[PDB]
Scaffold this motif. Structure first.
Motif, short mmCIF file in Angstrom:
data_model
loop_
_atom_site.label_atom_id
_atom_site.label_comp_id
_atom_site.label_asym_id
_atom_site.label_seq_id
_atom_site.Cartn_x
_atom_site.Cartn_y
_atom_site.Cartn_z
N UNK A 1 15.01 15.49 64.60
CA UNK A 1 16.06 14.52 64.47
C UNK A 1 17.11 14.92 63.42
N UNK A 2 16.68 15.48 62.31
CA UNK A 2 17.56 16.01 61.28
C UNK A 2 18.52 17.05 61.86
N UNK A 3 18.02 18.07 62.55
CA UNK A 3 18.84 19.12 63.16
C UNK A 3 19.66 18.57 64.33
N UNK A 4 19.17 17.60 65.11
CA UNK A 4 19.96 17.00 66.18
C UNK A 4 21.24 16.34 65.64
N UNK A 5 21.20 15.58 64.55
CA UNK A 5 22.44 15.04 63.96
C UNK A 5 23.26 16.11 63.25
N UNK A 6 22.63 17.00 62.48
CA UNK A 6 23.34 18.02 61.71
C UNK A 6 24.07 19.01 62.61
N UNK A 7 23.50 19.36 63.76
CA UNK A 7 24.17 20.17 64.77
C UNK A 7 25.39 19.45 65.34
N UNK A 8 25.26 18.16 65.62
CA UNK A 8 26.41 17.33 66.00
C UNK A 8 27.54 17.41 64.97
N UNK A 9 27.23 17.17 63.70
CA UNK A 9 28.21 17.28 62.64
C UNK A 9 28.82 18.69 62.58
N UNK A 10 28.05 19.77 62.77
CA UNK A 10 28.63 21.12 62.80
C UNK A 10 29.64 21.30 63.93
N UNK A 11 29.41 20.74 65.12
CA UNK A 11 30.42 20.78 66.20
C UNK A 11 31.71 20.04 65.82
N UNK A 12 31.59 18.90 65.14
CA UNK A 12 32.74 18.06 64.80
C UNK A 12 33.44 18.48 63.51
N UNK A 13 32.75 19.16 62.60
CA UNK A 13 33.30 19.57 61.32
C UNK A 13 33.24 21.10 61.10
N UNK A 14 33.66 22.00 62.00
CA UNK A 14 33.22 23.41 61.98
C UNK A 14 33.64 24.19 60.74
N UNK A 15 34.86 24.00 60.25
CA UNK A 15 35.49 24.93 59.30
C UNK A 15 34.84 25.03 57.91
N UNK A 16 34.23 23.96 57.39
CA UNK A 16 33.61 23.96 56.05
C UNK A 16 32.27 23.20 55.99
N UNK A 17 31.58 23.13 57.12
CA UNK A 17 30.20 22.67 57.28
C UNK A 17 29.36 23.93 57.61
N UNK A 18 28.50 24.39 56.71
CA UNK A 18 27.74 25.61 56.96
C UNK A 18 26.24 25.42 56.75
N UNK A 19 25.50 25.72 57.81
CA UNK A 19 24.10 25.41 57.98
C UNK A 19 23.37 26.75 58.06
N UNK A 20 22.62 27.08 57.02
CA UNK A 20 21.98 28.38 56.85
C UNK A 20 20.48 28.28 57.09
N UNK A 21 19.95 29.28 57.80
CA UNK A 21 18.52 29.52 58.00
C UNK A 21 17.71 29.30 56.72
N UNK A 22 16.75 28.39 56.76
CA UNK A 22 15.59 28.52 55.92
C UNK A 22 14.77 29.73 56.38
N UNK A 23 13.75 30.14 55.65
CA UNK A 23 12.64 30.83 56.33
C UNK A 23 11.97 29.83 57.29
N UNK A 24 11.82 28.50 56.94
CA UNK A 24 10.97 27.58 57.69
C UNK A 24 11.64 27.17 58.98
#
Ligand SMILES: [Mn+2]
Ligand SMILES: [Mn+2]
Lengths: 60, 168
Positions: B117-140
């Motif tokens: 659920x966390x990634x489902x909303x955060x991915x939505x926000x990345x589509x809508x806010x692309x230019x300065x929303x950056x979501x980086x790999x954990x190891x996990x």
């Protein structure tokens, strides 16, 4: 149904054997069967549910 | 793409999703029945996820950015997915909203019940806010992490296995 899919994943084979062996129960045992179909995507639908979507011209 | 274009079911009691670029009001709605602990319909969860994938597959092969002067950093380190943590970061700061640089530099998808659920909303926000929303790999966020902390099977119960393959 959220538990039924776990039961069916474990004990589907036994359930099929019932359809092979119990001439008395099989009419009622088939209703517990689940299958993939072209239009059911990546979910399994019951054979009775299949009829619910059946076209007016299908006989089969 | 084929599954969505076949529209096995289209829409659901909670979400009202658009074809692409889901409104901020619908992203808000989606978050506020994650408080209610509902889910997306499978087709509409796929509809955002394939569009997210396409955008991420086009976006720069590794990311370097000149950050601008007046804008204020929000960072998450690890935030092993929990709905109260999402509410609490909306206490900690205002909305990311193309208005603040928002970097999610974390383990998010693992060691918490609400983790798809966390990634489902955060991915939505990345589509809508692309230019300065950056979501980086954990190891996990990597494949084997989901086996060891069960997320692979937790998704497989919540949705059929192909969803988890897309998330992987
Ligand atoms: Mn961690
Ligand atoms: Mn980590």
């Amino acid at each position: 149904k959220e538990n039924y899919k776990k039961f069916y994943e474990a004990f589907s084979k036994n359930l099929k054997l019932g359809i092979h062996e119990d001439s008395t129960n099989r009419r009622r045992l088939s209703e517990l069967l689940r299958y993939h179909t072209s239009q059911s995507g990546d979910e399994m639908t019951s054979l009775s549910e299949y009829v619910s979507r059946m076209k007016e011209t299908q006989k089969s | 793409l084929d599954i969505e274009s076949m529209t096995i079911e289209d829409e659901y009691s909670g979400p009202k999703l658009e074809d692409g670029k889901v409104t901020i009001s619908f992203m808000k709605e989606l978050m506020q029945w994650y408080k209610d602990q509902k889910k997306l319909h499978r087709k509409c969860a796929y509809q955002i996820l394939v569009q997210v994938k396409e955008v991420l597959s086009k976006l720069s092969t590794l990311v370097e950015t000149t950050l601008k002067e007046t804008e204020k950093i929000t960072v998450c380190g690890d935030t092993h997915g929990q709905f109260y943590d999402l509410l609490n970061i909306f206490e900690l700061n205002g909305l990311p909203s193309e208005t603040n640089p928002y970097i999610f530099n974390g383990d998010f998808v693992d060691r918490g019940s609400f983790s798809v659920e966390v990634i489902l909303t955060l991915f939505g926000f990345k589509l809508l806010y692309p230019d300065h929303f950056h979501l980086l790999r954990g190891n996990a966020e990597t494949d084997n992490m989901n086996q060891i902390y069960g997320f692979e099977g937790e998704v497989k119960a919540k949705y059929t296995a192909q969803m988890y393959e897309l998330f992987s």
